Amino acid sequence: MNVYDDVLDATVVSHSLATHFTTSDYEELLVVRTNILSVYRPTRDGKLYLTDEFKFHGLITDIGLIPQKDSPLSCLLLCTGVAKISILKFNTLTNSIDTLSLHYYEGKFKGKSLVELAKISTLRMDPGSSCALLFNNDIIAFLPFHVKFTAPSVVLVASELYEGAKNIIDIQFLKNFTKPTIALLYQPKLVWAGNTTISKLPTQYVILTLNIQPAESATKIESTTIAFVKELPWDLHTIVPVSNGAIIVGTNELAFLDNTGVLQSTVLLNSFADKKIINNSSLEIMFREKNTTSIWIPSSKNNDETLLLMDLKSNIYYIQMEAELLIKFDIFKLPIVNDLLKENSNPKCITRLNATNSNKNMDLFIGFGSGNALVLRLNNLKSPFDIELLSSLRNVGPITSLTVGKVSSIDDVVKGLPNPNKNEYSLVATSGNGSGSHLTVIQTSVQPEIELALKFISITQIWNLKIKGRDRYLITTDSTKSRSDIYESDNNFKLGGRLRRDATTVYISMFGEEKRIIQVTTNHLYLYDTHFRRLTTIKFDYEVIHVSVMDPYILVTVSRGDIKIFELEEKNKRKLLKVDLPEILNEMVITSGLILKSNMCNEFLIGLSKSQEEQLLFTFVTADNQIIFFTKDHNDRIFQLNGVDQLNESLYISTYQLGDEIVPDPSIKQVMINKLGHDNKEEYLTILTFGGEIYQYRKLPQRRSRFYRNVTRNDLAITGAPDNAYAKGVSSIERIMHYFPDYNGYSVIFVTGSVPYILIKEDDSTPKIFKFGNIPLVSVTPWSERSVMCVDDIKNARVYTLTTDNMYYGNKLPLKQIKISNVLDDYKTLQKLVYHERAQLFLVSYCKRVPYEALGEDGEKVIGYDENVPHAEGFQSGILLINPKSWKVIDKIDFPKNSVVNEMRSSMIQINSKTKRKREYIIAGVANATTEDTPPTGAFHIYDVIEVVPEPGKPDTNYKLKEIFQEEVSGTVSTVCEVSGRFMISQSQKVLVRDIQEDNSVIPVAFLDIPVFVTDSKSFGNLLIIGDAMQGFQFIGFDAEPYRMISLGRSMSKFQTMSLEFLVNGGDMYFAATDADRNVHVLKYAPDEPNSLSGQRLVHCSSFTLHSTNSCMMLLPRNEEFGSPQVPSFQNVGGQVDGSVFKIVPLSEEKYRRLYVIQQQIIDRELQLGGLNPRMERLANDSMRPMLDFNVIRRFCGLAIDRRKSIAQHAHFEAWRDIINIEFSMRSLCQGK
């Protein structure tokens, strides 16, 4: 009984298409991460600015654009998991995606395939824009279009299309044909390197000119066979269509097959290809991908077309063409002399984003499955060309491993004062898969760099002032002691007089184009010159609470609820004038008012209608929750943000109408429309609830009157709860938002409280709240240029400025790229990172992909020994000890060739069994990854991290890995886990628990025969889950005094297990084991149940289809924020190959049943994006109590407050108080020792 939340949302760019979708104005680069479709508008500078982000409940397997009639903005087509086409029109009015048609094929496909369907059902679009096919493995769906939107869809096996076509290698639609044409590249007899000796030239390529004849009930498909090619290289895997005809990108051979059929020319790419124009290339390049990414660009204003192909090793290959007959056919590796694609690998999708009406000087986005998804600019095309990294989209690679560890809190005191992230751990990933692989510190909190830190006495609110841009005068105040003392630039008091120093000031700021100073003290407003002297004083009958300032205006809200707006007399700027505000709001009950300058309701105004200029409008929040506003020249015509009392997805501005619908339920404490992001300063209405809940609406560039928030996208995590739930986050320090136009270029909204939040928009993403340090924050003030001073609850003010050097502020959690692979040595691919608390430092096992040497136990190579050919990628591992204070690699302990540290864990192994002195040792399970027929070699390497004398120059190098014990043992050491003071390592089908003695003599003590290979092992005290590579997993108890590895329960459903890990939730324990089939299986050990057979058969209670193969699942404690922790509960934080990080946070059976009522009520009542029912989606074939997609629960959080309270089936509050318990489960990382 669990919830699944993406802690870090997916980031690996799998698919991307640059065609008008959101807006017809600019060419929009849609980018599929894996479940998150994000629409970017590339600028002339290249930087991708996100217009609209969409989170689909289900993996976007493949995407394409089909143009729709009557409208310029082209419809989208995405595939969800195994064969599930979703047609998507972007509705301009709602600014969200509506499904035109959903097409389930998974059912129809199983009824045609005799084999299991391939997980990645690949989609193909036709250039004629008439029929888009979806093929799995020899089985094809055809989705025709009328030129309703979609014609009734057919499903047919390739044997129905062509007489042969026995197993499809790749289909692609071909260029320039009147009626649409597929080109089925297939093998009748299947052939790999091994079948090559008997079957020669055994790939058949057939072009079939389809006759898509659609009837309104069901379509009939007859395929005219225009061309049949019989004898082609076995390796031909990808068909890429070019105007003259298809290119076939094979592993070793690359054959151009024209539209008429006959092979015009083929290029032998390397040494492995052999066969009619033959082109022999000695440049040993190979396309070892099953489907190689390839950007084909047509000619414009011409006979100049380009096709670029990409190796997995991330090399661009421009292929030359001459359409006439075909001459000039050769591949060319583009000279990447400035290695910027070195940091990337596994290119998944290339797309040209800027058309420039010319084939040369192209800007193209390449999405990578490893490195950052780069936007390149190719400047020329030669057979003075230079590529440049025009823009970057941050990709957290495949998150190879994941471990909690202190990256901050390593310094207990920084700049004198205590650390902002004191007693704060953060789960650090190992992103990247290649020469640009890097530790990614997936931080729970924004780690802010301190410029200046000073201790303060008896203060609560700070107001620094920049008299001429430079900060010169700082103001401190106290609510309790009743005093407001004024500091300086060098932080010295009374520098300076005539202030209301004896009473609590509420607001002090620059005024009248940085000449005057307004001090609003509780009872008396004041006006000052640059040098402080009282010029104008305004008295009030009631105590001033809410107060805002723009350049020529002050607004004050008194204790009664009455508001007063004041304008500066601009002619001399001395005295103050009362603004004749509309009398309509005097009857209204105002909670908080803010002066605002944005072009939000300028369309509704009589002056500058459709002009786009920031008219100064005074926003207010009514007690019945609606943002009312007006300009100075209002003429009693007041505007409102309509539908905030419900706070629904759309948020249009209209004229305010007063009646008797007044329900004083205040839930908008602070509201602000602010430009956000370092480059693309997008306006954002940002509601803050009295329950410390932040809602954030976007001002839409088209129709600026209408505001909209992506409810489906879970960008902003829930900071609070509306129905007084999570009161702990609001009752301590009052939640007040502070907008800063420049914090480090980045425009942010700081949110003060016990838990501080920072709304950071990056260009790459929707603006996200992040936890701002572990420390509480009382009040923020903008320190001298691109810096913000923040004061602690303990009154320790620190000038912070966000790091941008390697940080990224999308992915719904702030993350720090740590490139430890520097210039002098690149540790390509970082695997199985582990933190070591006894030394407070990280260990990561690098694994350089060495040229593999195929040899037995003897030094002689196996008989197929060839040196001229390019060798296969083997393994050359090694551990790096990294001290995270400096993040320099301290100690490199390399391993022999063919060796790879499959798993490495820091333990608490017992040194003496009687004494129970658990010294923290790391154990690296290295395995000599070799051929199947070579004897399996492996070694477990145990390391004690010792305080060594540091090198005279650099500090932090005061630790070195000490090889206390290593043993090159029979069988592959594929996993290590510390089972209660003893560590088990895997072997070939064996698991030996080793015990470490005080003499460092390590003896195996307990033994267990496992089914075929351990992928992953985890221990929960003296329990174990030893994951069998295809035979599910053994759940294993472990005894000591008589060392018995007692087999407790095999997983009944046997599956290719990916990463095991426990999730306990009290009482009976549950195990999450992920699959090769991207599927979490939660199995509980229930020996109480009779069907479970004494526990020996684990009851498979929940399956949950992920959006990626879970690379490393990892247990860490969860923060029970609302409730009290009687039993230490553990959530389950798993990485993803798509660069997501999920939490399988488990729940109480009461707690879950509340959310499962919500989930089932959200899916049914509220519509999803691609029409995809998440409960139906997150299921593949191995109890009716499913794991909950929190991505669909946080839709309840994004839901309209009226409908939200309606969905309660006393329980609404009880729901919220545990929805926070799921989102705040990661905040356990903010508690140390």
Binding site: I1003, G1037, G1067, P1087, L1116
Partner: protein
Amino acid sequence: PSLIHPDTAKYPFKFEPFLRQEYSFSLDPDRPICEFYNSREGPKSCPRGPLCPKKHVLPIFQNKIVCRHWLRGLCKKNDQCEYLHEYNLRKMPE
């Protein structure tokens, strides 16, 4: 708390009473060997019985020399074996 490796041997389970009855294995790994218990009789010797907080050594585990058959995962006598079912090199005939 201690977030980086909190494996926690002292976690309470619903199957903790079961694992004392069957398998003779409690959630405390290196718990002491209980007094007033002999392997020859079984649960009848101990006053606490099967739900004993301390551990119960089986006749197979107090046996001297290790099993060659169990070491290769195929001993006919899974219980009442004249050899040991504990893989320690101290008690080994090579």
